[PDB]
């Protein structure tokens, strides 16, 4: 295209957007000329580094520090061959909502900072070295997504530049930087305001979807006010990073040659499992941590306090954390119903050091009052949002609601935050944090002894600050899963206010995870995938949400079916049971060949070496949270898999799965709509008015002897 699409009719213009979700955003867009020919120096990646940068004396540091900006994103948007784009999309607070023009002023303050210090070179060589290392050390790749990307640039690059795609830069072009800096001016601004408070005022409706907006151009006072009032306040340039490693040495494997992490450290305080990288050989490491505490799920109130604590806590050092994540050091903080979840992923350089700073930070933390008010109100807005989501998400909520021991609803979560004061909170936290347990998986380029020192470090710091003492092995608990009366089928309904679609989910308590039941459920899952795919969604055209599958929970295996469509639910049940009879005939219709190819398909589906260190770590961690440790369950289950008949699954069907079943553990759940070839006589269910009084006469499952 020899032209841009924003041809001075819609430039220096404003939009007022009515969203579907309750979000608050401001969208700033700059159509900008082509730098595809300027791929050699590529100033736009450096600018994208410098816009959304979080550092000492930065703009966003101040705006977070003033509590005006919750989040932002800005940067270059790709476009056609002739033009390219530059977008800025920021979140809004209450005063962010009122001070928008001053926010644009703060944007212009950062622009004034950029004209004030001009171009920078040491930043360019530093980020160039970061992309050098990161392009330098790549393991392997997914053949999907990658190939589509490099085929996107195969059109644009020579046969030697298709690898070295953008991760290497020859020169510094400050004339280009200043040039696009001159392009970033109030002449060039597009404005889009997103608010749900726009009522009666936005007339121009979208043609396809139907959102409504209004132009209502900014008067010239603010514009001329925008050019002349260009000054700097307390702005500083961010400092050189120190998080660059020279650790590049791969450690040779020792006499302790194991394919699975060993319990190298046990205390009544801790429990530590460890394995080094056999395959991938990278200097990197991945670290997983659970912080166990009894008081996490005692009530809604304090769990909310934990969530807000962990959230505002994580947000505190985030401005410091930006360079580490910018350097390729990723992590995770997450509360659980049990406790807190920590993850540390990246290279071997300073995970102890930084993690020390993390433990000291979350150990010793202070509270601001208005920050507390914003986070309290913000998650309060996030609470009553939960009345409006998709019925499958709603169904998975009730799924994990009913199939645990205790569960706190969102209603009482909404009401209990009425009394939350900061002295009450900040008083409870060290009482909370006084006594807890940590279990951890560490994987990557390290030794056992250095791992012992890292763990030692952490818990030492813990006892140093809060005088942490270990837990009781009688308060090492899990939440159990509910026994059924072995033949009963109960159901109840929930009415969705907003959505016109109905949901439903049907659940089966088979057994614990014995070696037989894993292969039972996997094989039965595999055989029901394609005929359901063939008839229900395709042929019966019920809906798009049609899911089935496992439920590994509380050491108990389980079977579930997730379907959301706009139907009568008992009608929908009738076609579910019709699919069940269809499978019933499809049992006896299996040949030997279908059997053998089908179980070989499941074998290669199950058996695979991993393709990512994070992949196998999530699986292993999924054992660790279930305390199972059965490291070679795969070959064990395959050895069982070869010992299976057709009649085995007949006998699995008749007593456990069939309609004539003394071992029937069937339960359905209805999620209603907004205004909501042979079928037998199903038994009458009963409605579930009180789920506690529902569970009042239901027994509980045992737990698993750990392998």
């Amino acid at each position: 295209f020899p032209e841009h699409p924003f041809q001075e009719e819609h430039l220096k213009q404003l939009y007022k957007i009515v969203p579907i979700k309750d979000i608050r955003n401001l969208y700033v867009t700059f159509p900008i000329p082509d730098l595809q020919k300027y791929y050699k120096s590529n100033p736009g990646h450096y600018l994208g580094h410098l816009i959304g940068h979080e550092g000492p004396g930065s703009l966003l540091s101040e705006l977070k520090s003033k509590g005006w900006v919750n989040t932002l994103v800005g940067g270059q948007k790709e476009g056609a061959r002739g033009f390219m784009f530059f977008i800025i999309n920021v979140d809004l607070t209450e005063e962010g909502l009122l001070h928008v023009e001053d926010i644009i002023l703060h944007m212009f303050q950062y622009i004034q900072k950029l004209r004030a210090e001009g171009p920078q070179e040491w930043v360019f060589q530093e980020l160039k070295d970061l992309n050098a290392v990161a392009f330098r050390f790549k393991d392997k790749e997914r053949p999907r997504g990658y190939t589509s990307k490099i085929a996107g640039i195969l059109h644009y690059y020579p046969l030697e530049e298709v690898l070295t795609a953008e991760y290497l830069l020859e020169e510094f072009r400050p004339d280009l930087i200043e040039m696009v800096l001159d392009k970033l001016r109030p002449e060039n601004v597009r404005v889009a305001i997103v608010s749900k408070s726009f009522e009666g005022k936005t007339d121009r409706t979208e043609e396809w979807y139907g959102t409504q907006y209004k132009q209502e151009a900014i008067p010239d006072e603010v514009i001329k006010k925008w050019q002349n009032a260009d000054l700097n306040g307390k702005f500083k340039l961010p400092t050189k990073n120190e998080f660059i490693p020279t650790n590049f040495e791969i450690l040779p494997l020792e006499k302790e040659a194991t394919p699975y992490p060993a319990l190298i450290k046990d205390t009544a305080m801790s429990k530590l499992w460890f394995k080094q990288d056999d395959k991938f050989f990278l200097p990197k490491a991945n670290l997983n941590f659970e912080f166990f505490s009894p008081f996490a799920y005692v009530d809604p109130l304090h769990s909310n306090m934990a969530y807000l604590y962990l959230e505002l806590l994580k947000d505190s050092l985030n401005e410091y954390a930006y360079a580490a994540e910018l350097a390729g050091l990723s992590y995770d903080l997450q509360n659980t119903i049990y406790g807190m979840y920590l993850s540390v992923k990246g290279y071997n350089d300073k995970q102890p050091i930084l993690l020390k700073k993390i433990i000291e930070k979350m150990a010793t933390f202070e509270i601001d009052e208005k920050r507390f008010e914003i986070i309290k109100e913000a998650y309060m807005r996030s609470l009553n949002n939960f009345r409006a989501e998709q019925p499958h998400q709603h169904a998975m909520y009730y799924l994990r609601l009913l199939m645990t021991e205790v569960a706190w609803t969102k209603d009482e979560l909404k009401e209990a935050l009425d009394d939350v004061t900061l002295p009450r909170l900040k008083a409870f936290i060290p009482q909370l944090l006084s006594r807890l347990h940590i279990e951890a998986l560490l994987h990557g380029n390290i030794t056992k002894q250095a791992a012992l020192g890292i763990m030692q470090m952490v818990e030492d710091t813990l006892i140093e600050h809060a005088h942490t003492k270990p837990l009781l092995p009688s308060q090492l608990v899990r939440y159990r899963e509910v026994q059924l009366p072995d033949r009963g089928w109960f159901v109840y309904q929930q009415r969705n206010e907003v959505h016109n679609n109905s949901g439903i989910e049907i659940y089966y308590q088979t057994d614990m995870q014995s070696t037989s039941e894993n292969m039972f459920l996997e094989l039965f899952a595999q055989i029901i995938s394609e005929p359901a795919f063939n008839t229900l969604r395709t042929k019966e055209q019920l809906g798009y949400i049609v899911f089935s599958g496992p439920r590994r929970a509380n050491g108990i295996q389980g079977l579930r079916f997730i379907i959301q469509s706009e139907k009568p639910p008992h009608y929908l049940e009738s076609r579910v049971e019709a699919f069940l009879i269809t499978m019933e005939k499809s049992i006896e219709d299996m040949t030997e060949e279908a059997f053998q190819k089908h179980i070989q398909a499941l074998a290669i589906r199950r058996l695979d070496k991993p393709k990512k260190l994070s992949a196998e770590s999530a699986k292993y961690w999924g054992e660790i949270i279930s305390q199972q440790y059965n490291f070679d369950r795969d070959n064990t289950e395959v050895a069982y898999l070869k010992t299976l008949t057709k009649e085995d699954i007949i006998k699995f069907y008749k007593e456990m799965l069939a309609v004539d079943a003394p071992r029937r553990h069937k339960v359905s759940v209805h999620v209603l709509a907004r205004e909501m070839s042979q079928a037998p006589a199903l038994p009458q269910p009963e409605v579930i008015q009180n789920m506690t009084e529902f569970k009042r006469g239901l027994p509980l499952f045992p737990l698993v002897k750990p392998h």
Partner: antibody, heavy 119, light 108 residues
Framework: EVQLVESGGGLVQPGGSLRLSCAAS????????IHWVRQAPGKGLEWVAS????????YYADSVKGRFTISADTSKNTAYLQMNSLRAEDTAVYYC????????????WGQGTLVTVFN | DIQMTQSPSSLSASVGDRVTITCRAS??????VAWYQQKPGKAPKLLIY???SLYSGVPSRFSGSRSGTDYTLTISSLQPEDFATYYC?????????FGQGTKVEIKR
């Protein structure tokens, strides 16, 4: 072509609540927008408030922020100000005033209005 | 947050006199300051905007001068109608401040 008719200002006791109007006729509040001004008798000035009805941006003073409520009917080019918890230092005569397209240009003025806080 | 020192508080001079009045900002300000006139029982008037520029419709006998923080309205020749209280005002996104008020009286 420019007409600022503010009115509605009467007589009230302390602790009460009132609402004031400002009708910007001859032009649009979608253009360069209006301001609220405290002026005590025999005393100086204050900039009470400013709405930008094109962008919905409110801007308040530091002392009485939150307790007062501005609103703006764009269909009549006419803004409003709910007042609450009225106190005895606010008995004065108040003006509405238009900033024009300039960097500091606050050219036009209004009729003024009567504010009275009395036992 | 920046306050305004309107100097002097007042003075007295007659028609055809040179009156320079200096408002001083508390901080280093880029001149967004206006200068005003208000006769009693009347609406105020924009004499000088941007602390140096003349509003259209005002005679050019009046002028404003940016000098760092020292901002100064200069009257070349006084008039029989120019006896009114004057002001100066700083307008950023920050809330707008004013001057102390300077009443113009005659010399008798």
């Amino acid at each position: 072509e420019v007409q600022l008719v503010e009115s509605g200002g009467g007589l009230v006791q302390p602790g009460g609540s009132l609402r004031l109007s400002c009708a910007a006729s001859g032009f649009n509040i979608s253009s360069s927008s209006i301001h609220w001004v405290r002026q005590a008798p025999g005393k100086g000035l204050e900039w009470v408030a400013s709405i930008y009805s094109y962008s919905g941006s409110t801007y308040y003073a530091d002392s009485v922020k939150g307790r007062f409520t501005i609103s703006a009917d764009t269909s009549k080019n006419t803004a409003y100000l709910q007042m609450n918890s009225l106190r005895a230092e606010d008995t004065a005569v108040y003006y509405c005033a238009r900033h024009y397209s300039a960097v500091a240009g606050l050219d036009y003025w209004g009729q003024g209005t009567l504010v009275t806080v009395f036992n | 947050d920046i306050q305004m020192t309107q100097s002097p508080s007042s003075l007295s001079a007659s028609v055809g006199d040179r009156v320079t009045i200096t408002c001083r900002a508390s901080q280093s300000v880029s001149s967004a300051v206006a200068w005003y006139q208000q006769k009693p029982g009347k609406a105020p008037k924009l004499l000088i905007y941007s602390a140096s520029s003349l509003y259209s419709g005002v005679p050019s006998r009046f002028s404003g001068s940016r000098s760092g923080t020292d901002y100064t309205l200069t009257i070349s020749s006084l008039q029989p109608e120019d006896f009114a209280t004057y002001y100066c005002q700083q307008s950023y996104f920050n809330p707008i401040t004013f001057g102390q008020g300077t009443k113009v009286e005659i010399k008798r």
